[model samples]
Target chain A: CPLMVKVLDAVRGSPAINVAVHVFRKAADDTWEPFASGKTSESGGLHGLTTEEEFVEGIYKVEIDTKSYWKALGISPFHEHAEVVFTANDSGPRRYTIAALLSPYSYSTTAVVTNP
Target chain B: CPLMVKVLDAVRGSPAINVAVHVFRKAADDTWEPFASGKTSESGGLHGLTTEEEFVEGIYKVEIDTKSYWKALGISPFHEHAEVVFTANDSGPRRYTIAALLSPYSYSTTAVVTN
Candidate 1:
């Protein structure tokens, strides 16, 4: 499975750079295990996440370290963390991008699945 | 026409108190005119807002003075203001409530119309 993750500052309506991003897979015990992790680039993207690990059809979670990001940006702490839960399909070679739209205190996500 | 407005801090999942709330009507020139203004109570509510003025069926705006509220709460500035635009129907005596969900840097609104 090919997955791309990105974060956007919805309040500022721009890419949220330098934010810590993590991808987790729900283990058999229903606990999340960190699968991949990285910091956002200047464009706020982490592409080809599954390249480091095998992408499978299962529940996955994307977590954004908003606390550190806000502190780095000199903003007040609003949310401890922002997360989005999404499921990948069985298509092994298809691409998916999960975009997390974030604000200081709120967030949402949308997935563009089955892309080339 | 009757209207109630409330504010909730979505981040905390609780009522947002001490927030300044204002109601404005769109004038013929499309500019907003201050119609009603008040501060949220302990429960973050301004009930019966239209009682002060005749609630007419027209475009109205609800403005939250987030700047003042955040400053008072000792939070950093993230937004200048938060506003929601809604229209009232011709039902002259109906009740409406607008709930503005607020966060430190973001906000959204939903109206319980015809309620």
Candidate 2:
């Protein structure tokens, strides 16, 4: 896989299980086209979001439906959603790991990229 | 001040300097109203973004001009800007530290709240 996501619950200090994730690619017309979507596994990992062949050099967005996750835990969150937008595979083929830490009142996302 | 921000450059693994940041509070009508603004200092910290007296219970958005920061470094970044939105002081007065790690292709933001 070319892209992976890991979501952690800051409040619980554990993996954010079953969190919804949506992936999108930027079209030439500047619109977002759906690419892939899934839910975080038990370990907070979404390892099969996209393959190398289908994920070419382009701009991408990863949206985490965090509000729903918090609501399920009986907590009210602040953000409508948490999103990370970036360009990928521009220089060459690379693997990306998006790590997100979520709290009811806040969240943080980081990317770890490596050559494939 | 009740709010602070810290920005770090993931590529360089150092504090991101001089990045512009804007603060907004959600108004009663649900529109974002400008509250305060500042640039990250040499230590990559904005310690005076807002005072406790004016930062009431409401939703707030912190926008970091990441594109400009990368542009100045001759790098092309992914997002138009990086923003963190959350509710503040809802249960009572509390302090917040918004910490962000930035990369040309990605960025992460986390908040540390204290009572």
Candidate 3:
């Protein structure tokens, strides 16, 4: 498997902020497993990530905890979570980079993986 | 209309982070409008966000600048951006709460609108 997507947390005006993330892969039964997990760096975001090749093959999903993350700010939030489901073409040439852009109110995900 | 989602930025280990976001609403032309916009907090997330009610009806989309956000962090990221699209029911109970959860490598979004 390859890296499915990249997550970038944004501050309203600045770029220094906190960010947490998790990756999961689909199994034969159609369930999911923790693929990899990490957080963004306040000084440097893309600073941490487990890796892509190790993630299992097949369908994958990613979920992030927003409500809990906001509660720390002493703020009330309307959304609780964010999720995405994607698929891998094959195990060979498992090279892909998925990017995720996020803010307090909304975000989006997209990536491309080589089908090997 | 009401708010459809919220966003929270997180650091890999620490909590302080920088996150940016956008919200859009579908119009009769099937396009989208700048429904709402905001950024995550450095000390506190969920700090900056435009109100929702004005966000029109129909399908909505939200996109974030991940790759660019990371680059600003002095790091190169694999993903350049993140995107999410959802649907709104009607106007009467047009209250929506959509949240975008974010990390460096990945993130997700979800919310509860008074549909």
Candidate 4:
């Protein structure tokens, strides 16, 4: 696997389960084309978003459906969605882990890129 | 003031200086109305973004010019900009500190709310 995501709930101080995640790759025309999609598992991990063979040098975007996650818990959130956009595999194929912390009103995202 | 912002460069692990910050409050009509604007100081902090009297209970947005910050350093970034939106003072007037970590391709924002 070349890509993975970890999501946490700031309010709850635990892993955010079942939060929807959508991944997009930038196309030649500068448009965001769909690449893959999944949801965080019980451990707040979404592994294997993309494979090493298909994950080439390019820009990618990861969208987290935070609105639904908050609403389901009877809370109102500020952002409609939270997303991270970044250039990937510029030097070579690398493993990427996106870690996100979500609250009803705020969110934080960090990335760790390493050799696969 | 009831709000402050701290920005850090994840790549350099130093305070991000001169990053522009814009504050907007949700108007009664649900449109964003400009409230204030400023830039992070040399210490990576933007204090007094809004006063307590003016920052009432409402939704607010804080937009950070991450793109420009990276460009000034001759580095390319991914997001055109980075922003944080949240409802403020819902229960009562409280202080908010938004802490952000920025990299060339990734950024993270966390809020510390207190009475």
Q: Who wins the lDDT comparison?
A: 2
Give the runs in model 3 whose Cα sits over 4 Å from its true position.
A1-5, A9-11, A15-17, A43-53, A89-91, A112-116, B1-94, B97-115
Per-candidate chain B TM:
0.85, 0.94, 0.64, 0.94
In model 1, what lDDT does residue B50 have? 65
Q: Model 1, range A1-116, lDDT digits (tens) per residue?
A: 47888887754556889888888999999999988888888898877566624877778898889889878877666788888787766555567787877766666778887755
Q: What interface RMSD does each of the candidate structures achieve?
A: 4.3, 3.0, 7.0, 3.4
Model 1 pairs whose backbones collide = none
Docking level of model 3: incorrect
Rank list by lDDT: 2, 4, 1, 3
Please give the lDDT score at residue A47 for candidate 3: 37
True contacts kept of each: 0.25, 0.43, 0.16, 0.45
TM-score of chain A of each: 0.84, 0.98, 0.67, 0.97
Give the least accurate 10-residue stretch of model 4 chain B, judged by summed lDDT: B85-94
The collision pairs in model 2 are A108-B109, A109-B108
lDDT of 1 at A46: 79
* Tens digits of lDDT, candidate 2, B1-115: 6889999998888999999999998898888899999999999999877776898888888889898999999987767678777777557447788888898866777777777
The Cα error of candidate 1 at residue A80, in Å, is: 5.2
Please give, for residues A4-83, the per-residue lDDT of candidate 3 as tens digits: 33555564434324556676777777566777776645642443344444554466656655545656766554444455
Tell me which of candidates 1 and 2 scores higher on lDDT. Answer: 2
Give model 2's TM-score for chain A to 2 decimal places. 0.98
